[PDB]
Design an enzyme around this catalytic site. Structure first.
Site, PDB file in Angstrom:
ATOM      1  N   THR A 169      18.614 -53.537  56.697  1.00 41.42           N
ATOM      2  CA  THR A 169      19.966 -53.935  57.061  1.00 41.42           C
ATOM      3  C   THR A 169      19.950 -54.548  58.455  1.00 41.42           C
ATOM      4  OG1 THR A 169      20.445 -51.724  57.906  1.00 41.42           O
ATOM      5  CG2 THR A 169      20.966 -52.171  55.601  1.00 41.42           C
ATOM      6  N   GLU A 204      20.862 -59.163  65.221  1.00 40.35           N
ATOM      7  CA  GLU A 204      19.598 -58.774  65.827  1.00 40.35           C
ATOM      8  C   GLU A 204      18.761 -60.012  66.110  1.00 40.35           C
ATOM      9  OE1 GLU A 204      19.555 -55.568  66.255  1.00 40.35           O
ATOM     10  OE2 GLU A 204      20.800 -54.749  64.644  1.00 40.35           O
ATOM     11  N   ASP A 243      24.766 -58.634  57.349  1.00 38.80           N
ATOM     12  CA  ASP A 243      26.121 -58.108  57.328  1.00 38.80           C
ATOM     13  C   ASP A 243      27.197 -59.173  57.452  1.00 38.80           C
ATOM     14  OD1 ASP A 243      27.830 -56.029  56.968  1.00 38.80           O
ATOM     15  OD2 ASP A 243      27.643 -55.200  58.992  1.00 38.80           O
ATOM     16  N   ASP A 261      24.222 -41.272  54.842  1.00 37.05           N
ATOM     17  CA  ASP A 261      22.872 -41.060  54.330  1.00 37.05           C
ATOM     18  C   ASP A 261      22.604 -39.571  54.145  1.00 37.05           C
ATOM     19  OD1 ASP A 261      23.245 -40.875  57.006  1.00 37.05           O
ATOM     20  OD2 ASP A 261      21.368 -41.853  57.593  1.00 37.05           O
TER      21      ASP A 261
HETATM   22  O1  LIG Z   1      28.600 -53.389  61.509  1.00 35.86           O
HETATM   23  C1  LIG Z   1      27.399 -53.229  61.412  1.00 35.86           C
HETATM   24  C2  LIG Z   1      26.514 -52.795  62.460  1.00 35.86           C
HETATM   25  C3  LIG Z   1      25.205 -52.668  62.201  1.00 35.86           C
HETATM   26  N1  LIG Z   1      24.642 -52.926  60.984  1.00 35.86           N
HETATM   27  C4  LIG Z   1      23.212 -52.743  60.825  1.00 35.86           C
HETATM   28  O2  LIG Z   1      22.992 -51.537  60.164  1.00 35.86           O
HETATM   29  C5  LIG Z   1      22.117 -50.716  60.935  1.00 35.86           C
HETATM   30  C6  LIG Z   1      22.915 -49.772  61.804  1.00 35.86           C
HETATM   31  O3  LIG Z   1      22.097 -49.379  62.883  1.00 35.86           O
HETATM   32  P1  LIG Z   1      22.657 -49.688  64.397  1.00 35.86           P
HETATM   33  O4  LIG Z   1      21.638 -50.475  65.156  1.00 35.86           O
HETATM   34  O5  LIG Z   1      24.082 -50.136  64.338  1.00 35.86           O
HETATM   35  O6  LIG Z   1      22.601 -48.110  64.831  1.00 35.86           O
HETATM   36  P2  LIG Z   1      21.912 -47.609  66.228  1.00 35.86           P
HETATM   37  O7  LIG Z   1      20.447 -47.905  66.220  1.00 35.86           O
HETATM   38  O8  LIG Z   1      22.696 -48.761  67.126  1.00 35.86           O
HETATM   39  O9  LIG Z   1      22.416 -46.252  66.598  1.00 35.86           O
HETATM   40  C7  LIG Z   1      21.304 -51.701  61.753  1.00 35.86           C
HETATM   41  O10 LIG Z   1      20.327 -52.259  60.915  1.00 35.86           O
HETATM   42  C8  LIG Z   1      22.381 -52.729  62.108  1.00 35.86           C
HETATM   43  O11 LIG Z   1      21.889 -54.015  62.362  1.00 35.86           O
HETATM   44  C9  LIG Z   1      25.420 -53.340  59.922  1.00 35.86           C
HETATM   45  O12 LIG Z   1      24.978 -53.583  58.822  1.00 35.86           O
HETATM   46  N2  LIG Z   1      26.753 -53.467  60.210  1.00 35.86           N
END
Ligand SMILES: O=c1ccn([C@@H]2O[C@H](COP(=O)(O)OP(=O)(O)O)[C@@H](O)[C@H]2O)c(=O)[nH]1
Ligand SMILES: O=c1ccn([C@@H]2O[C@H](COP(=O)(O)OP(=O)(O)O)[C@@H](O)[C@H]2O)c(=O)[nH]1
Ligand SMILES: [Mn+2]
Ligand SMILES: [Mn+2]
Lengths: 775, 773
Positions: free
Chosen positions: A178, A182, A232, A437
């Protein structure tokens, strides 16, 4: 009167000087189409089809088809000519089909443009490359198709197919990535790590007891593994990321725009068995399907698409879910698959989550604190939980499931937030499903007529890049502890399902009950964690300083002013900091207050460093009785004992100071910010009124949802804060240190004994189950 | 393996447009209609907005011919005529645009010609009595849509009003801003305005007291224009729209038809609407209704009103009031009388009160609001009008002569709209959240002009205050949020009065004295929660604990209850304050009605017991001269001013209810306020589009970050200043050393307010006789 008359006279001169031919206008408009108007016309046709206006949808469809048919002739780029000609021909075919459907010679339900998947040559290739065997069709051609399927359950029902299905290959292990806003380097690292995993899987020696056998053997494993990258939102992905995707031969903006004009696709699928080369070594090909979605959604929606559509399409044997930018060790996939195959009972597994380059940049305190927290959380909590066959999976961790205890009820429960709007569910379920999850974990554990447990794999190390700033860590813990504080409440409230529905063994249910009692005690202790920390610091440090209970100093007489001054200063500083934390948290976003958060964090930091020094002083001044040494070792050196037992004690030795400097900031700030958040004109008028009433009802529903959500969050926050305050005030006013410190020590000792026993059980299980496999 | 083979065989069987380097039948299958005509026109307007002149004309011809063909089939004669007229006008504009593109006619920024349409009103009263009226104006209603983005160019673009066309020159000009209200408020407002016009009509001639000039009898209604401006056609009440159609002012059919391709920015409906109530026929009232599509602010409504209409017709006096504000018969007469006799007032404010105070006396919120309005008006407005500078209450019925508000004050008012608030900052944002008093300050300190202000007591304007504590919370959330930054502006820029304005020496000295008083008053009110907590704590609980209540002897007691009272009070106050700030800075105060009512009741009975112990402490004290003097001057100042102004029964009835709501008032409201081309060109165009979208999102998030950071910093400053002050005085000062200071401070403030009220009384009762000198 004269100025008035003058101004009105100039106005009167002002009004004079349609004031302030049809054949000529008709000739001008009559006197070629273009790609812009063709795309706009097809967009309007797609909107009309979505709104179920078939006559004008058709009318807008032939216009766009003929527009692109005429445009394709004059274009100079041969690939653009081909794309536009194909789009026009397909649109004309769809127009003919729709006309026949309207005439009724063919009867069909919910007509839609035919699904067309196009393969265009990849712009970039490496002539010098090494591979086992590959066909020119799969290697050179990149496949893309736009999908309209709104309910991913019917993804395979609408005729959508993947290249794996078309070539007949049968993927078994299947990974999701996902990605959202990034950078390219994170994707490059993730893909390089996956390629390394596949290469290490290839390099397994045949005919070995330890080595895997079956579909994951050497020279043929990359075919059976499919990697699904689901974005996304096309408006949020990084332009450099899209440039990288084009570089690896997986994305094409021109093709997407040309072939996604009139379809009205919800998301776009790009399929390419992309091959990668790093320095003089060439990574083995990795099968990748990239699902770029049109409108912004959540990670839950990305998993909805991934799981439902692709998993129900291809029926993977093992399904893995992973974030973007997480580097896997060479043997992470091997350890996961080895555990799955050898157990044949695990419903889902979670890999170890760590920090990239912990030793490097040791000067950063936040990085070291996060590394310590990850290591302790993994070791203690994951070992204790996996000993009981139930894991509260850490958010963002590299976790995998087998698509046999996931196919039905757990996935329905996971996605019921998307399927049924949260207005009916309420705010409790929504806050539950911010992080679910672990909801998947609980549902797999409590599957009806199934005893599928979990397992934490220490050796499947997944290295991620944690935020290097306190504000980023604050946002991370805003997500993490919320999900957490709500999936936990779900677990207590629904622990009865494990015995009522699932068929576990009697010993397994007894162990689950024991873990449930422990989980109740641990959650109750952690709910009052801020109050307990404040009481511990207050009592020990300041009431040893004021009542001369520090066995290394003599404060019997003193000035009598500083004795009370220390307690007063500590109480006032703590209360002011807590109030400021409430205001800032609940208030604005924690990014513009970087300086304020750093100041509060530093205040708490030196506050618990002086606390650590005075605690060490009283410990070393104590004559070290048997009971005292036992309780102290059990409550403190539990971390070091577990770390030395599992092998990685040096990380703790390096980061324990950084973590204990960040302990009060951690608990207080993170928990407080988490808890803190062809009709006539009459028909036209009737349609306008209906649209207005629809808008009003939508606005009232949204405001009611917001009212319920904010009211629930404020009620839960008030309950938490007032419970902590009432507990602290009551024990302060009605209990001395001699009557409360022993109780706190016994409680923390019980919790740490439970966690030590869990870690020891994990170690003995993972080092003894191999020899006792016969029995 | 068998299930997988079976599934793949099933997919193979299920897999039957079918699933580099016939058309004749469909064409044969391929009349117009009003819906597609409106949609086509509409886009044409969007394309013209996007400066797509090469496209625009073709969609405009499409829509014009569509309606030209449609109008014939319509059975409704009025719809047929309206559609035919619109089609002819659209074709004429299409021809003009074609000529403009050809270049035979050169013009800048082409736009469809502005045309006003007169349709007969559905409802008319055959039986009516009037001085004189023409059939054209009476029977027919005019309407025109407007495109003017900057209302400064309203007269430049060719927009004219019926008053201008008939040559009528309005002098008094009154605005009625409306948004999502019901018909009864508008009906009450229009009835009250008609009563005011009737009172102006029946004034006797040849009298010293009576007005003379353009406001004489039998002709006053001609000289007054009412401008009612809505905030958004998507937010106005359906019932309100039905009422406007009933009074002959609004038409959905005409608006939708004539606004199809114009892309108008607001719709003007002009009708000298006549109203009849019971057996009395109200005199006609000239009314112009401006309905804009998109939700905006009251500031934007005033922008439209002032700039466009005021620059068009140049009124002698402009007036502003909200809906639901019933004016007494003599409100307009008093305003005009004061303006004409003074010739120096730059702007006036009418008295704001509550409708039916005596009725529904059981409502503590209504009684407290009535008391607050009365005392605020009397004390503050009298003291301020004595110094010729009024901090006008929000929503109050106010007027300004269009001679000290023409330029710089109006530009300062609307600069938030003209230049975006990102450059200004959050200070200026919450500064202009309410700026009627900003007009007041700009008029007072206008360069090369000494125009003061005057508060008219007799111009009573009765409104309908919220009947619920949450509604009062929202009202005060707007009010003193604007007011605090208003006082900040006046404090910071009080130097303009001496640097730029040309006032007399005595006037500048009086302004300096009022500035010192305003500094002291704002400083005292900033620490109002801390001061109230200290007063309650010290007096009540340190008299109970230290046996300083002269009506009881608590010297020995149980020694547990003595400290228990103070501990209970401190804990309850702190818990209430923490819960208040959280609830206030968190969720919207409308789902928590039970919680707010609980906290308000706790504070209520708390100050009831505080008042009882104070009275006991005021009846057991031997009442020395100093004590009686300070107590009368600090408490009975309200009753003295009320008796002086004649309105003392309201205070006698509502003082208990207000003192029951003082702590909720001060704590809750202050907390909740401070708390809140080819394919390459197509690709390049898409890149520009979402790059601009990303930039706009970044700008919006930066604006929100700055505003929220400033809000939280100011709130932290306020709360921590109050807490530090309270803790310091509690720990380092006894009641014997801080109660005298607080009494002296409150006595000084109440002496200033009493002197202001007395000065206003003596001025308003003596200036008449001493008019010769
Ligand atoms: O609105 C959102 C924000 C994040 N993501 C993605 O889903 C995962 C969520 O992990 P995130 O990095 O947000 O969590 P963290 O590492 O910041 O605590 C990552 O792959 C994000 O790129 C997504 O699909 N939608
Ligand atoms: O976004 C808005 C909200 C209100 N108003 C109107 O402007 C005035 C604002 O006064 P409000 O009703 O807020 O004050 P109240 O009558 O509630 O004390 C009233 O006439 C509203 O109808 C407006 O033009 N725009
Ligand atoms: Mn991440
Ligand atoms: Mn109102």
């Amino acid at each position: 009167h004269a100025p008035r008359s003058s101004m009105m006279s100039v106005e009167y001169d002002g009004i004079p000087l349609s004031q302030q031919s049809y054949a000529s206008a008709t000739d001008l408009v009559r006197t070629i189409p273009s790609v812009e108007e063709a795309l706009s016309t097809l967009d309007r046709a797609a909107a009309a089809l979505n709104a179920r206006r078939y006559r004008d949808a058709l009318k807008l469809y032939l216009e766009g088809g003929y527009a692109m048919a005429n445009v394709a002739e004059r274009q100079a780029n041969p690939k653009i000519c081909n794309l536009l000609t194909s789009k026009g021909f397909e649109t004309l075919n769809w127009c003919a089909r729709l006309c026949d459907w309207i005439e009724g010679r063919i009867k069909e339900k919910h007509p839609r443009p035919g699904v067309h998947k196009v393969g265009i040559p990849v712009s970039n290739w490496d002539e010098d490359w090494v591979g086992p065997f590959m066909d020119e069709e799969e290697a050179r051609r990149m496949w893309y198709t736009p999908v309209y399927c709104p309910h991913p359950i019917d993804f395979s029902n609408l005729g959508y197919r993947l290249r794996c299905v078309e070539t007949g290959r049968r993927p078994r292990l299947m990974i999701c990535i996902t990605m959202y806003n990034e950078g390219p380097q994170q994707l490059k690292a993730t893909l390089k790590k996956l390629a390394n995993n596949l290469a290490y899987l290839k390099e397994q020696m045949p005919g070995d007891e330890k080595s895997l056998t079956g579909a994951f053997a050497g020279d043929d494993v990359w075919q059976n593994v499919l990697v699904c990258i689901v974005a996304d939102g096309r408006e949020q992905v990084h332009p450099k990321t899209l440039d990288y995707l084009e570089a690896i031969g997986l994305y094409d903006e021109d093709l997407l725009t040309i072939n996604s004009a009139g379809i009205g696709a919800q998301c776009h699928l790009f399929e390419h068995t992309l091959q990668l080369s790093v320095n003089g070594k060439c990574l083995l090909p990795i099968q990748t399907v990239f699902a770029l979605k049109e409108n912004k959604a959540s990670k839950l929606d990305s998993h909805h698409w991934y799981f439902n559509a692709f998993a129900e399409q291809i029926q993977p044997e093992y399904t893995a879910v992973m974030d973007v930018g997480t580097m896997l060790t060479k043997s992470a996939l091997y350890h996961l698959l080895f555990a799955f195959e050898r157990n044949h009972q695990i419903g889902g597994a979670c890999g170890q989550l760590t920090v990239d380059n912990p030793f490097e940049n040791l000067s950063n305190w936040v990085i070291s604190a996060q590394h310590f927290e990850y290591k302790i959380s993994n070791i203690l909590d994951k070992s204790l939980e996996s000993c009981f066959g139930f894991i509260s999976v850490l958010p963002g961790a590299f976790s995998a499931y087998r698509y046999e205890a996931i196919r039905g009820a757990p996935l329905d429960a996971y996605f019921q937030t998307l399927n049924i709007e949260l207005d009916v569910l309420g705010p409790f379920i929504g806050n539950m499903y911010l992080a679910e999850d672990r909801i998947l974990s609980f549902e797999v554990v409590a599957r009806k007529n199934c005893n599928w447990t979990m397992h934490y794999v220490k050796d499947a190390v997944a290295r991620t890049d944690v935020p290097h700033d306190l504000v980023g860590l604050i946002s991370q813990r805003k997500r993490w502890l919320n999900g957490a504080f709500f999936a936990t409440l779900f677990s207590i409230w629904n622990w009865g399902r494990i015995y009522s529905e699932s068929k576990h063994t009697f010993v397994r249910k007894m162990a689950f009950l024991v873990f449930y009692v422990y989980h109740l005690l641990y959650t109750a202790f952690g709910f009052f964690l801020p109050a307990n920390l404040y009481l511990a610091l207050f009592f020990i440090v300041f009431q040893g300083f004021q009542q001369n209970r520090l066995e290394f100093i003599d404060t019997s007489e003193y000035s009598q002013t500083v004795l009370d001054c220390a307690v007063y200063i500590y109480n006032f500083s703590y209360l002011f900091g807590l109030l400021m934390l409430i205001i800032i948290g609940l208030g604005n976003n924690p990014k513009h207050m970087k300086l304020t958060y750093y100041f509060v964090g530093a205040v708490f930091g030196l506050m618990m460093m002086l606390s650590s020094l005075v605690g060490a002083g009283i410990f070393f001044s104590t004559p070290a009785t048997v009971h005292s040494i036992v309780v102290s070792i059990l409550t403190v050196g539990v971390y070091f004992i577990a770390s030395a037992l599992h092998g990685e004690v040096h990380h703790i030795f390096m980061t324990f100071t950084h973590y204990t400097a960040l302990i009060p900031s951690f608990v207080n700030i993170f928990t407080i910010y988490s808890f803190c958040n062809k009709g006539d004109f009459k028909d036209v008028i009737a349609k306008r009124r209906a649209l207005e009433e629809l808008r009003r009802e939508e606005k009232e529903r949204v405001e009611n949802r917001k009212k319920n959500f904010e009211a629930f969050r404020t009620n839960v926050l008030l309950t938490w804060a007032f419970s902590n305050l009432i507990f602290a005030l009551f024990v302060v006013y009605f209990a001395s240190s001699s009557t409360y410190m022993p109780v706190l020590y016994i409680f923390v000792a019980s919790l740490n004994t439970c966690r030590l026993l869990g870690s020891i059980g994990h170690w003995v299980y993972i080092h003894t189950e191999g020899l006792r496999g016969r029995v």
